[PDB]
């Protein structure tokens, strides 16, 4: 929207680029706005559609999810790394409301610009949606739902149905709602003197394109993927207390230490020094074979000398995995991971409380991959999800798809209270901000009546992905919240309304409660937090000063 | 400017439009391809090679198509070969299709993609049903069954003149690899082919064919009992991780360093010839010194061996691989060796080692092959793939399901039936899916020669009354029975090619918008 | 069966061809409207700014109004033109409000666009705007009070109207000698026929704006003055003024006419022949007592000599239009044949001198009571002021011009727009549809015309549009903002008055525009 | 638009194997049928062409 530049003045002079000030920053920090607000327009809601990126070398990626589209996207405008990086933090603290924090904060910034031409200042329009963030934060602690009579897991099984929708699990999503429950209460441990944490990414995701999505299967335990270093190692373990060694001590011909020079004076003296450079490695595999382990896992690779004994004693090697991929094997099956073998005593031994326990150990192949599935462990359970799809651009996005359903499930569980979603809070918050500062009225009226008026723009972009007509279910949703604000606690009715509105699929209104979609109260909060900060700091910024690179 | 972005954006109803014409267009190269009178499609590598097959795998693979949404059928084709290996043609045919037969719309009705996803999920589950009711489970322990089985994919290659022959080859290879439930690998399966050669004289030979002669004139090529030993480490000598930097004060010191460099590799020698074996495989390399010591007592010396050929060594004489010389024992001595030859080929020389065949760990066989180029030797093998590959869906899903294009055609009719007892809004995309499943089977016509619009109407109309067997004729043209036809194929094929098709679909019609160079 | 090689695809429109369609191709038209309007929006107002802009013949102009500085810059998208063609069909018809015609079209695009961005498609957001522009011009009808009623007098009707138009030019401050001039300029102009070529301005350089003069005749210039001026007198007392199409010259734009003579005594007649023929047209003018001779085409030389024996001035090279203008105020009209001028075709004047002002001579016709035409002379230190306080009496003289063809007395300064907002809230209530958020949403574009008043004076917006729904709660009318009290009250009292073509056309043009742009959703632009 | 849509309709006639020779003489003798049927259908027959 900006024409004919701006004219060059000879009497201000400054290295590097031109400085730009007035209302042309403003207008360009709108303009860097709807820029990377419209790309993630289309891609909320059920019936919203994801978008494509090429990489320049061949290969794309297909994802809903409005952090990875940010990530991919340089911004080189400096107002607009800052909804890049909102995204970033939206999905790394919640996990959820990613799409929607850039759409909130991308209409707060174009309206408040359009309240600067009004001739308020910012600071007053900055107080006024402070002022009215608190009055809305208060009103969400109203609308809070404790789950009550509620029969089974249907509690988290009607939520995580909801971060499924938008993407390629959504109609899949039947039968993953119980994996992903089943998926977090199997990590579930204890931490902070009784308080109950789950760790995150613990779910091990494999991709394995063939058959179909609805066919993947939930294995009771972790899964490792890795390939076995000998052939001839069984790929099978029968019999229950299988015991797991988890080690990071490699097996190989290793050199003695650079501050080290050999210097020998006698031929004779070659036969036992090269034969002790193996030998020192075998005292510590001889008392490992001799516990009884089974599996030994191993973080660095394992060359072909140690590889002989694990045959002839039938025990199965493993060479290179993740580092945090051992730590859950040790202590779900029991096992203490050794970063290096010592013991309080100046001599090495090994005790058999390194050692974990599970019901079984073996190696399934997945298409033309091969994997361990571990089920049955001992001390701690645990879970691992394998993905089918078509093809491997698929399983990328089932990945971001079920990371994101991990995160939802995950604050679930941390506060019971629940609230509404599809559109429901968004309705809700603008009639109560309607009422609100007409008591004050004065000059901050108007800036509070816009940010009402903001929110409305998650409701109504939901019914245009869906080629229906936004107007009718925007004028319903305002005409049920409304006339019900000024109820009373008696005689009931009234209150009864209000509580759910906009059914993307049926375009009509339907109770969520019945329908199902909710959504955790932590994903609401901190969600219009971090997207006021992101408006204030573009909001407040008068010029823009660019420096050529040296 | 701003970022990494515009150009020209593809916005509205024509990015969808630019999926399903780009990715259509990835069918119509290899639509000929399909049937047993498929042509052959010549392709062009920057390396300077040839590639020439019918297969819609390897075509598929080595074009390079650059476009967001074709690129994704090119992955449809390794999920057909690694998850089977049989079907990679008749899935990339249907998903195209599918696109194209299933989603006209948006483009006049403008109804949402979900919804008809939602349809095409529903689609898919009554597609499943139909397949196993036309299904006719058939004995896996039939020698005569199989044979006609493994011709189902023979039929649409050049082999089909050999396949008498042919069913021969993959019928051991198959039983031979199968472990006692009955899970079999192509890893341990050897790919090596012979240049020349009459192809009736290949045959599938138990062992490991070397490509090495012999290290020394006097090691026996001809033994009634090989032994084999495989050692992992050098038969040189090491020089050890750290440097050994011996310091000589007397002239009789350097003399003792390079006769203990003789008497060391002597002295490995000597434990091998404790449990004498006649044949030693070493994977590195060999000094000419010990050979020697090794020749004395009859054990035979050979080139560095990979890694690779070392594991199919010791399945098949039992060995189990040795790395350290002194804890080397009688117990890990391979044994049961039929034969041991070398036979003279002007290209490399041969080293047959024979299985004495008479439970424990699979067998390794490898197949020898004999063509009239190198190039209709990779054609062949990538036959045998296709070829083996049918006989392990058949041990593992004993099901058997109708072929000759009766699986497609058997799914659509059953699917316009209840397209007009649901109703409501996904009607459409229900019904569409039938017009995509009828083109696989219409194929076969196009290719035949013969009229699409009179058979495949008598088709669906003897399909009710008939028989579910009942198909297109590939050579004739003509409306037959599979049951008199004679070949059948399994269901793991049909269940691929259904799932695989209907699950790419519904992400390209997800696409709302394409950007293209934004950033690597 | 190809041709060879490979053939690429063949694109259906010529390459090089922009074209996009969807809702992102009318929010990029929408986008080009708002940018231009950004430049007209603090021109608005007695208090508005000019603006300055260079062309790139480096050619120097200066116009406060947007009918002009649409007119300097080439407007390349399709959608910006609709706002130039807004601005030129209200100078051409009226002249008065270009720049709000502007700001009322750009505005409810502005106002269109959350409804875009919603489920609702163009063509029902036109039918709010169709809708309700049919009721907001039978609402000034219904304000406008006739003049006759009180049975005022007809001269000062015409000064208080005058001096509404004179605000954000350079005249607002010098308006007390200024209107007296235009107001007097109408008058001399029948009734029935008003024409803007004869209140033509002539550019003077040099001089000051309040040294004009206004003088019921006109000025023809100066073109040559051949052999025999400045011994002319300059100063006539009842000189008749007679003018002629036919050309004065001896064989000069006449065809070539070859003569031949075969004798040498014949070939002295021929010679004296041409002297016959030039002064015999000479001396019928002579015969008729005319003291002033005009001519469209040059005057020779032996024409000048002639008359300068006899004092009569005489000065050709005059262009038509200046000629068109002087033959109404002399009577009777120009005779192109020497022989058939009559004593009734002469013209006459109570005074006439000629005086120079910036180093240039001008013969002004003074003492014409019976003169339907009127002349204008203005002065200034720069070369930009004449064309600015030029084109500011045009306008001026517009307002004049289409007040006694029909007297309405309508509302202005945001009087007018935001009495009619109210009214069509009131009607949007018991609409209870879609057209009830855009009747509200074109009710709330007409605000913007007050709002560039208070945003350009330096108060706040906020405040005084508060106090203006509280006071138009109950009937008001001419109530608006005031910038000398600084408060904001009634305007009939404060005697500024505006036609009704101004408020009329300026509704009529905002919706025309605005629907002609929303109902494109595809812009090709070929080469 | 009618005759966009009529080789629209087409595409499915063509991939079903139809030759475009009998698809001439379908829209041929479709288009005789069609002029002749509209003229039971005028209720709008009106002789003034005055008024």
Known sequence: ?550 | ?520 | MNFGSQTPTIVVLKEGTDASQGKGQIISNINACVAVQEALKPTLGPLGSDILIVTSNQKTTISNDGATILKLLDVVHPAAKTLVDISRAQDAEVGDGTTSVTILAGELMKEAKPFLEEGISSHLIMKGYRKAVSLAVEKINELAVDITSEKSSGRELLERCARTAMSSKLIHNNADFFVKMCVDAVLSLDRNDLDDKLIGIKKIPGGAMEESLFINGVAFKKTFSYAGFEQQPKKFNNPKILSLNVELELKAEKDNAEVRVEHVEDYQAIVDAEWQLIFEKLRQVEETGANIVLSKLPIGDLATQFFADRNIFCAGRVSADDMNRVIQAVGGSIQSTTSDIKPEHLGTCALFEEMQIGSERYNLFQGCPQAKTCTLLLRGGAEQVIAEVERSLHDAIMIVKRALQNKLIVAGGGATEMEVSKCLRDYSKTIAGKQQMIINAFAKALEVIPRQLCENAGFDAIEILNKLRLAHSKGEKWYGVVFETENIGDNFAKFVWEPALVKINALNSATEATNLILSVDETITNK | ILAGELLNVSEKLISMGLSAVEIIQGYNMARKFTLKELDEMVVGEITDKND
């Open chain 2, 1 to 520: 400017v701003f970022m990494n972005a515009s150009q020209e954006r593809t916005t509205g109803r024509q990015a969808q439009i630019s999926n399903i014409t780009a990715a259509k267009a990835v069918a119509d190269v290899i639509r000929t391809c399909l049937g047993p009178k498929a042509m052959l499609k010549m392709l062009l590598d920057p390396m300077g090679g040839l590639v020439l097959t019918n297969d819609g795998h390897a075509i598929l693979r080595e074009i390079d198509v650059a476009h967001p949404a074709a690129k994704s059928m090119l992955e449809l084709s390794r999920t057909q070969d690694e998850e089977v290996g049989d079907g990679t043609t008749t899935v990339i045919i249907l998903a195209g299709e599918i696109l194209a037969q299933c989603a006209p719309y948006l483009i006049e009705k403008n109804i949402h993609p979900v919804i008809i996803i939602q349809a095409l999920k529903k689609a898919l589950t009554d597609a499943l049903e139909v397949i196993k009711q036309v299904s006719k489970p058939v004995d896996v322990e039939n020698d005569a069954a199989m044979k006609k089985l493994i011709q189902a994919s023979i039929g649409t290659k050049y082999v089909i003149h050999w396949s008498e022959k042919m069913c021969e080859l993959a019928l051991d290879a198959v039983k031979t690899v199968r472990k006692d439930f009955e899970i079999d690998i192509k890893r341990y399966v050897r790919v090596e082919k012979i240049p020349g050669g009459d192809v009736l004289d290949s045959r599938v030979l138990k062992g490991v064919l070397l490509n090495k002669d012999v290290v020394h004139p006097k090691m026996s090529r001809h033994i009634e009992n090989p032994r084999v030993v495989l050692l992992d480490c050098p038969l040189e000598y090491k020089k050890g991780e750290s440097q050994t930097n011996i310091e000589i004060e007397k002239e009789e010191d350097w003399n003792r360093i390079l006769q203990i460099e003789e008497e060391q590799v002597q002295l490995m020698c000597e434990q091998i010839l404790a449990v004498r074996p006649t044949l030693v495989i070493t994977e590195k390399g060999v000094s000419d010194l010990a050979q020697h010591y090794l020749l004395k007592g009859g054990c035979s010396v050979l080139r560095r061996v990979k890694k690779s050929d070392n594991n199919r060594i010791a399945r098949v004489t039992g060995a189990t691989i040795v790395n350290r010389v002194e804890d080397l024992k009688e117990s890990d001595v391979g044994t049961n060796c039929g034969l041991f030859k070398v036979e003279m080929i002007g290209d490399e020389y041969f080293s047959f080692l024979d299985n004495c065949k008479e439970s424990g760990l699979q067998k390794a066989c490898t197949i020898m092959l004999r063509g009239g180029s190198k190039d209709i030797l990779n054609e062949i093998d990538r036959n045998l793939q296709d070829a083996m590959a049918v006989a392990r869906n058949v041990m593992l899903s004993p099901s058997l399901s109708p072929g000759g294009g009766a699986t497609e055609m058997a799914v659509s009719v059953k699917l316009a039936e209840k397209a007009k007892q649901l109703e409501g809004i996904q009607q459409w995309p229900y019904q569409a899916v039938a017009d995509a499943m009828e083109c696989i089977p219409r194929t076969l016509i196009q290719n035949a020669g013969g009229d699409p619009i009179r058979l495949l109407s008598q088709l669906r109309a003897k399909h009710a009354q008939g028989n579910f067997t009942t198909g297109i004729d590939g050579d004739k043209g003509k409306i037959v029975d599979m049951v008199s036809y004679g070949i059948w194929e399994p269901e793991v094929i049909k269940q691929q090619s259904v799932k695989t098709a209907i699950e790419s679909a519904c992400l390209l019609l997800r696409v709302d918008d394409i950007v293209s160079g934004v950033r690597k």
């Open chain 1, 1 to 550: 929207m900006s024409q004919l530049f701006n004219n060059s003045r000879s009497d201000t002079l400054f290295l590097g680029g031109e400085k730009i000030s007035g209302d042309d920053i403003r207008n360009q920090n709108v303009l860097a706005t709807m820029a990377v607000a419209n790309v993630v327009k289309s891609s909320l809601g059920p019936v919203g559609l994801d978008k494509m990126l090429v990489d320049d070398i061949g290969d794309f990626t297909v994802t809903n999810d409005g952090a990875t589209i940010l990530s991919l996207l340089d911004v080189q405008h400096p107002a607009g790394k800052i909804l890049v990086e909102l995204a970033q933090q939206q999905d790394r603290e919640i996990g959820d409301g990613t799409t929607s924090v850039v759409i909130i904060a991308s209409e707060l910034l174009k309206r408040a610009n359009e309240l600067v031409k009004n001739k308020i200042h910012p600071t007053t329009i900055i107080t006024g949606f402070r002022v009215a963030l608190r009055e809305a934060i208060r009103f969400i602690n109203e609308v809070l739902s404790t789950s009550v009579d509620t029969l089974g897991k249907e509690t988290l099984i009607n939520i995580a149905k909801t971060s499924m929708s938008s993407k390629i699990i959504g109609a899949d999503s039947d039968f993953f709602s119980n994996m992903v429950v089943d998926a977090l209460l199997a990590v579930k441990t204890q931490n902070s003197k009784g308080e109950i944490k789950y760790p995150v990414k613990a779910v091990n995701v494999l991709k394995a394109h063939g058959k179909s999505a609805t066919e993947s299967l939930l294995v009771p335990g972790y899964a490792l993927n890795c390939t076995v270093a000998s052939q001839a190692m069984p790929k099978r373990i029968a019999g229950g207390n299988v015991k797991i060694a988890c080690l990071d001590l490699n097996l190989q011909k290793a050199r003695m230490a650079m501050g080290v020079q050999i210097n020998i004076d006698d031929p004779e003296q070659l036969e036992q020094i090269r034969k002790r450079e193996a030998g020192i490695v075998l005292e510590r595999v001889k008392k490992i074979i001799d516990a009884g382990a089974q599996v030994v896992l191993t973080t660095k690779g394992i060359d072909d000398l140690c590889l002989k004994e694990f045959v002839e004693a039938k025990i199965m090697g493993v060479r290179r995995c993740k580092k945090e991929d051992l730590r859950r094997i040790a202590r779900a099956t029991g096992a203490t991971l050794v970063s290096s073998m010592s013991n309080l005593e100046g001599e090495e031994t090994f005790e058999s409380s390194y050692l974990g326990l599970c019901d079984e150990v073996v190696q399934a192949k997945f298409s033309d991959d091969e994997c361990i599935l571990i089920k049955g462990t001992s001390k701690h359970s645990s879970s691992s999800i394998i993905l089918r799809g078509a093809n491997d651009y698929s399983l990328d996005e089932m990945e971001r798809s079920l990371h994101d359903s991990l995160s939802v499930v995950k604050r679930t569980l941390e506060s019971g209270n629940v609230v509404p979603g599809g559109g429901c809070v968004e309705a809700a918050l603008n009639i109560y901000l309607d009422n609100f500062a007409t008591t004050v009225g004065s000059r901050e009226q108007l800036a509070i009546a816009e940010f009402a008026a903001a929110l409305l723009i998650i409701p109504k972009t939901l019914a245009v992905n869906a080629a229906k007509d936004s107007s009718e279910l925007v004028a319903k949703l305002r005409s049920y919240h409304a006339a019900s604000q000024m109820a009373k606690p008696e005689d009931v009715k009234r209150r009864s309304y209000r509580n759910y509105g906009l059914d993307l699929i049926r375009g009509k209104i339907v109770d969520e409660i019945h329908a199902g979609v909710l959504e955790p109260t932590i994903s609401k909060v901190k969600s219009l937090k971090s997207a006021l900060e992101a408006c204030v700091a573009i909001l407040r910024i008068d010029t823009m000063i660019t420096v050529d690179p040296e």
